[PDB]
Design a protein around this ligand. Sequence first.
Ligand SMILES: *[C@@H]1O[C@H](CO)[C@@H](O[C@@H]2O[C@H](CO)[C@@H](O)[C@H](O)[C@H]2NC(C)=O)[C@H](O)[C@H]1NC(C)=O
Ligand SMILES: *[C@@H]1O[C@H](CO)[C@@H](O)[C@H](O)[C@H]1NC(C)=O
Ligand SMILES: *[C@@H]1O[C@H](CO)[C@@H](O)[C@H](O)[C@H]1NC(C)=O
Ligand SMILES: *[C@@H]1O[C@H](CO)[C@@H](O)[C@H](O)[C@H]1NC(C)=O
Ligand SMILES: *[C@@H]1O[C@H](CO)[C@@H](O)[C@H](O)[C@H]1NC(C)=O
Ligand SMILES: *[C@@H]1O[C@H](CO)[C@@H](O)[C@H](O)[C@H]1NC(C)=O
Ligand SMILES: *[C@@H]1O[C@H](CO)[C@@H](O)[C@H](O)[C@H]1NC(C)=O
Lengths: 243, 48, 246, 49
Amino acid sequence: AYTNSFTRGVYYPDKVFRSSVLHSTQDLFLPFFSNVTWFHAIHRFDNPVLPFNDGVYFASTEKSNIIRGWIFGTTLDSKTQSLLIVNNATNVVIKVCEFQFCNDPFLGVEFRVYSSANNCTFEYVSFKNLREFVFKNIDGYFKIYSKHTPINLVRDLPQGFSALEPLVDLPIGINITRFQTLLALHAAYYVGYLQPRTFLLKYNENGTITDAVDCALDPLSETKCTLKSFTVEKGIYQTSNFR
Amino acid sequence: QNAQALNTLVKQLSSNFGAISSVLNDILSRLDPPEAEVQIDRLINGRL
Amino acid sequence: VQPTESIVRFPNITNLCPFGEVFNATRFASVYAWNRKRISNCVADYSVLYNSASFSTFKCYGVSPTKLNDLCFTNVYADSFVIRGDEVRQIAPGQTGKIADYNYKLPDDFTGCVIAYLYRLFRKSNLKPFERDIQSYGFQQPYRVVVLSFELLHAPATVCGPKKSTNLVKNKCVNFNFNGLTGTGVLTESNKKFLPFQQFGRDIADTTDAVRDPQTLEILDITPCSFGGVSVITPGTNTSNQVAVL
Amino acid sequence: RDISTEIYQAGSTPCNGVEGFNCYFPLQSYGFQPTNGVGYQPYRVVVLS
Ligand SMILES: *[C@@H]1O[C@H](CO)[C@@H](O[C@@H]2O[C@H](CO)[C@@H](O)[C@H](O)[C@H]2NC(C)=O)[C@H](O)[C@H]1NC(C)=O
Ligand SMILES: *[C@@H]1O[C@H](CO)[C@@H](O)[C@H](O)[C@H]1NC(C)=O
Ligand SMILES: *[C@@H]1O[C@H](CO)[C@@H](O)[C@H](O)[C@H]1NC(C)=O
Ligand SMILES: *[C@@H]1O[C@H](CO)[C@@H](O)[C@H](O)[C@H]1NC(C)=O
Ligand SMILES: *[C@@H]1O[C@H](CO)[C@@H](O)[C@H](O)[C@H]1NC(C)=O
Ligand SMILES: *[C@@H]1O[C@H](CO)[C@@H](O)[C@H](O)[C@H]1NC(C)=O
Ligand SMILES: *[C@@H]1O[C@H](CO)[C@@H](O)[C@H](O)[C@H]1NC(C)=O
């Protein structure tokens, strides 16, 4: 029920073009080599509501597209407005409403996700393959990144490097504490969490992120971050600190 | 050494030194003079 | 070198919020059963309503009609109800009478503009601001009044007034403010290639280098205007008074 | 110190010396009464430079 992240979880942190340079940034990223819990939500079912904390990494591999969306809210009750993301086979359903969810939301393929709604604020409509997403909510803005690429291993996330691209910066302004994935039923995915870490990002002539270094993995990475290079020559160097 | 010193001097322009913003125009637009002049004074001291 | 002309360019102010759904519609509800209209996810262009003809009154409270195009608020409410001409003063902060204390009470701290039918004659408690707790009055004059209540909260704001994202806009050799970018310099067509989500370019010194045209998605190099010191060449004054400058 | 009473124009249509839509007389008379509140009571203020 555990796989390790390897080199997954890199996204473009801004919309600035930089060519043939090396840049250091401080933001929430998935830690390197921190193992990722592999869930089988239904096989005996466990489709629970997990805390959101400061952001959540998500990834999955499916061809039947069983996971249709996610549910976000504080109490998951109609007392306070909640967010609902549903991906139809035709379009996207995004809601921000005081939403009375059920004890076991699912997309009957009936609608037993909820029972009623009181207010509504926001509405928006727009193999062996891995779709990868990053969710975070800062200053009332919901931010989502995406990238699609083929794979050859199912049980575990294959190694490699490919950055995620920005998709939506939605200005709603919702308090958020917990989430739960939405599935269609007549279930394999992963959950990663984001932490504040400093990274080096390598840009090619096209402005494409091609490599990265985590500054807290090991002393060699600390030296690389200090020297602002991917190559370190012979000698002694100081990443000084104390305990 | 010369290039390192010049790069450090150039990169020092982005700091706040305790002010609200590192851009003069933002300070001018977001506030009235009786506090914008204080913020600009702070920035001036840092760059000096 | 001083800048020559300041052609600051911003895209079209689109889209347009449906003000005509309330300001320009045909039905206004009763004063004791007033309808509050929620306005969001749109550009609130107040020039059309301010410049609209045949308006009996145009009263602002803490706001200016020429200024509202530059205010961004999270939530704006369009209160719509029928009232008679004589009681049009009841929609005011602190005003008393039948309508305010029985039908429609406006907050004493109201901020916005009021632009311009059943009597409740018996109450047990004075109505709160924006309260609707639901004597027939015969129109033998009615005035259609809309109240613009501007509420700002800690949520992201959705109704400002200016252009949003995707419209038509140009660029020249300017001083050279576009959108959120400022500063002077000369602009040249650039051969660089941005990613579709990339808008700016930056040098190793973390300085703006190139910018993409918002309308015709082309990238322009930013070269600053020339500058330099000036020196004066001269022999001794006891030899001549001629000089040459560099 | 400006001492003028021209009808202010907030619109593009000229006032032609009358009040109306967007047209205002700049001055409003002070409603000083013995029944007024403390904050609306008249106050004699002297400025020394
Ligand atoms: C990264 O930049 C290089 C620049 O050399 C690109 O290589 C050329 O790309 C163009 C199309 O963008 C092709 O028509 C050329 O044939 C490529 N050069 C050669 C020698 O084949 C490269 O494609 C860029 N990569 C990305 C992902 O944009
Ligand atoms: C990594 O695995 C250890 C046990 O092997 C576990 O305690 C830890 O929480 C895992 N890291 C995660 C899930 O980020
Ligand atoms: C939305 O919630 C407010 C409370 O803040 C309530 O007054 C209003 O009636 C609700 N809207 C509905 C039920 O349509
Ligand atoms: C709600 O969010 C605000 C700011 O986003 C925060 O200050 C507050 O503590 C949050 N409250 C809860 C119950 O999460
Ligand atoms: C949009 O901008 C163009 C400039 O080419 C102008 O001709 C047109 O009138 C504008 N339309 C609106 C609705 O702003
Ligand atoms: C808005 O006003 C115009 C007159 O300028 C009228 O033609 C149009 O029908 C009105 N729209 C609505 C929805 O009443
Ligand atoms: C220039 O010459 C005059 C006399 O020829 C003399 O009085 C003066 O001091 C001289 N000044 C300089 C700067 O040489």
